[PDB]
Structures are given as C-alpha cells and as structure tokens.
Amino acid sequence: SWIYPTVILCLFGFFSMMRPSEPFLIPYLSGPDKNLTSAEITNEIFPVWTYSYLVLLLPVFVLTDYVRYKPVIILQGISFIITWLLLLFGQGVKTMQVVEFFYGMVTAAEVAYYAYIYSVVSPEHYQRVSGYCRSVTLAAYTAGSVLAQLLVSLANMSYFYLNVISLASVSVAFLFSLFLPMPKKSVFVQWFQDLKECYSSKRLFYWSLWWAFATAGFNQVLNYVQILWDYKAPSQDSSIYNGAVEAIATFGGAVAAFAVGYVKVNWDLLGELALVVFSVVNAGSLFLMHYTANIWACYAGYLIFKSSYMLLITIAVFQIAVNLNVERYALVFGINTFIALVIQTIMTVIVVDQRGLNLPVSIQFLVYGSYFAVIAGIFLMRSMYIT
Numbered sequence: 001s002w003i004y005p006t007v008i009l010c011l012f013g014f015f016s017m018m019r020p021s022e023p024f025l026i027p028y029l030s031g032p033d034k035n036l037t038s039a040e041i042t043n044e045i046f047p048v049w050t051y052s053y054l055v056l057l058l059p060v061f062v063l064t065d066y067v068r069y070k071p072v073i074i075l076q077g078i079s080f081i082i083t084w085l086l087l088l089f090g091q092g093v094k095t096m097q098v099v100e101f102f103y104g105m106v107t108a109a110e111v112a113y114y115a116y117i118y119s120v121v122s123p124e125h126y127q128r129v130s131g132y133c134r135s136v137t138l139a140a141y142t143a144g145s146v147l148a149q150l151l152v153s154l155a156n157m158s159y160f161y162l163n164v165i166s167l168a169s170v171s172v173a174f175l176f177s178l179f180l181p182m183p184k185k186s187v188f189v190q191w192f193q194d195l196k197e198c199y200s201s202k203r204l205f206y207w208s209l210w211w212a213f214a215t216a217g218f219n220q221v222l223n224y225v226q227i228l229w230d231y232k233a234p235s236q237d238s239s240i241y242n243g244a245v246e247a248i249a250t251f252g253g254a255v256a257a258f259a260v261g262y263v264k265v266n267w268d269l270l271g272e273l274a275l276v277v278f279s280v281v282n283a284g285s286l287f288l289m290h291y292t293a294n295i296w297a298c299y300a301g302y303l304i305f306k307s308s309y310m311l312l313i314t315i316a317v318f319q320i321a322v323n324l325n326v327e328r329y330a331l332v333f334g335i336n337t338f339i340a341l342v343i344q345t346i347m348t349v350i351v352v353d354q355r356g357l358n359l360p361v362s363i364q365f366l367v368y369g370s371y372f373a374v375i376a377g378i379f380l381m382r383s384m385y386i387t
C-alpha cells in the first residue's frame with residue numbers, strides 16, 4: 001500500500017540530492033569553469049539564495065497543501081533542471097544570481113518533498129516512511145559526495161561534468177516526481193486562526209519549536225563546519241578530507257534517519273526523551289567540535305552532531321505528521337523551515353556577518369554549541385516543568 005509512493009518519492013529525493021556538484025560547488029564557480037571571484041560568490045551570490053529561499057518558502061507552506069504537494073515537488077524538479085541548466089551554461093554573476101534564486105526554489109519546495117508522503121500514506125507508516133525519506137535524502141548527498149570524490153580522485157572529472165552528472169541525476173529525479181502518485185484531496189486572520197488550529201496539537205508545537213530553532217543552528221554548522229575544519233587543520237589536502245567527512249557524517253545521519261524509520265520503538269513516550277538526549281548530544285558534539293583542537297576529534301564530533309540531529313529531525317517530522325491531525329503537512333513543515341531560516345539568517349547576521357559581531361570561527365562554534373545547549377536546556381526545563 002505505502003510501498004510504491006514511498007519508493008518513488010525516495011528515488012526522487014535520492015536523485016534530487018545525489019548531486020556530485022554540491023561538495024565541489026564553490027570550486028566549480030570559482031575555478032576556470034566560471035572564473036568568478038570569491039568575494040562575489042559569498043557576499044553577492046549566496047545571500048541571493050538565502051533571500052530567494054525565504055521568499056519562496058513564503059508561498060510554499062501557503063500553497064503546497066492546497067495543490068496536494070505534487071506540483072511543488074514537480075516545480076522543484078523543473079526548477080532543479082533550471083538551476084543546474086543555468087549552473088552549467090550560464091556565465092557571469094548575472095545568471096548565477098538567477099541560479100541561486102532557482103536553488104532557493106528547490107530548497108523551499110524541498111519542504112513539499114518531505115510533506116508529500118504523509119499526505120499519501122497512512123499515519124501508521126509515518127514512522128517508517130519518515131526515516132526512509134530522510135535517510136534516502138541523506139544517502140543521496142553522501143552518495144553524490146563519495147561519487148564526486150571518486151570522479152575527482154580517480155577519473156579527474158572536471159567540475160563542469162560533475163554538474164552535468166548532477167543535472168542528469170536531478171533530471172531522473174524530475175522523471176520520478178512526474179510518476180509520483182497524486183495525493184487525495186483535503187480571510188488572512190482566519191488563515192492564521194487555521195494555523196492556530198494547525199499548531200494546537202499534542203507534542204507538536206514543541207517539536208516545531210525545536211525544528212524552528214535547532215535546525216537553524218544545524219544549517220549554521222553546515223555552512224561553517226568547513227571553515228572550522230580549515231581553522232583547526234590548515235592543510236592543503238584537507239579539502240578532499242573535509243567534504244568526504246561530511247559524506248560520512250551525512251551517511252551517519254542517513255543511518256540515523258534509517259534508524260528512526262526502522263526501529264519499532266514508540267516515540268509517543270520517548271519523543272521527549274529522544275529530544276532531550278539527542279539535543280544534549282548535539283550540544284556536546286558542537287562543544288567538542290570547538291573546545292578540542294584535534295582535527296580527528298572535530299571530525300568525530302561533527303559526525304555525532306550530524307547523525308544525532310538527522311535522527312532528531314526525523315523524529316520531529318514524524319511526530320509532527322502523526323500529531324498534526326490536520327491535512328496541512330507542508331504548512332507546519334513549511335512554516336517550520338521558514339522560521340528556522342529566519343532564525344538562521346538572524347544569527348548569521350549577528351554571529352559571523354561583518355554587520356553583526358563578526359565572531360571568528362574559533363568562537364563561532366562555541367556560540368553554536370551554546371545555542372544548542374540553550375535549546376537542550378529549554379527542553380530540559382520543559383521536562384522538569386512536566387515533572
């Protein structure tokens with residue numbers, strides 16, 4: 001019953017994130033392929049992606065539930081084709097901003113990817129499905145990652161052909177999304193009131209708050225983990241190591257996500273326990289990622305953080321899906337990702353951006369670990385409040 005939609009969406013998400021260009025993205029548009037300077041790739045190109053992500057998530061959670069979650073995925077698939085098509089044959093920064101915009105489209109519609117399956121499978125499978133979905137996505141990345149590595153370590157494949165393989169993968173993902181089964185069917189203040197009815201669920205607003213907050217710190221860690229590794233071990237070869245470790249970490253997260261789907265354990269009573277334990281694990285790993293000036297210890301801490309957070313976000317998505325009791329799967333997922341991106345952008349402005357505090361990378365992860373520890377303690381003091 002649930003096997004065909006789950007398998008098709010898992011194949012889509014695998015081929016929509018099996019992107020060998022992703023680990024070698026910055027070298028691709030900063031090397032001979034595009035000849036863009038590094039001060040226009042991060043101060044003018046990536047903020048465009050962030051802004052497009054915000055303004056494209058804004059109509060995702062509003063409209064994805066109404067359109068039954070397939071067109072936004074199909075819009076994600078087509079915009080994957082546009083993103084990497086302009087990433088392949090678009091020179092200069094004028095076209096690359098448009099690509100950052102379409103990648104914001106694909107990332108905002110990635111909310112539809114997660115929320116579609118809960119609108120097409122019964123709640124009983126919401127655990128298993130969840131894991132698998134998240135797992136395959138993470139598997140996707142690490143697959144692409146390791147694939148990319150081999151293509152640059154054994155076949156000297158140029159970054160342009162890495163992006164070509166990425167486009168071919170997301171093209172197969174678009175074809176799989178075309179074959180996704182269509183889910184069955186089903187002023188402003190009222191809409192907000194509906195959101196209030198959609199957010200008054202049991203053990204969901206707190207999982208939502210974790211999603212709205214912990215994933216912002218996770219995305220900050222994702223962005224600046226390579227910079228932390230460069231600070232810890234300024235090695236010329238470390239690059240091939242760095243992304244590779246991400247692969248393993250992502251792979252770990254994959255299996256961690258694959259854990260949540262596979263284990264026949266009840267998160268109804270262990271949801272709070274899993275939240276507390278693995279949020280404390282994330283905080284401790286982030287502190288370990290910073291406090292210990294050992295590159296191998298930092299890699300292990302990053303693997304632990306990524307795997308535990310992937311497990312936690314899988315539990316969060318599953319628990320929100322079962323406890324939602326409203327058809328708006330992508331509204332809560334979409335607004336969760338939008339609020340998380342808002343918090344991530346705000347803490348990027350303060351923590352690392354020149355406009356804010358501009359904290360060096362040797363205290364960046366200190367404050368990231370402090371942020372995750374604050375999140376965990378908030379969910380510590382919630383358990384004590386429950387008593």
Ligand SMILES: CCCc1ncc(C[n+]2ccccc2C)c(N)n1
Binds near residue numbers: 022083
């Ligand atoms: C398709 C090319 C456009 C594009 N590709 C990859 C990223 C990856 N990235 C970069 C910085 C911060 C976060 C993330 C996910 C990006 N922002 N933009």
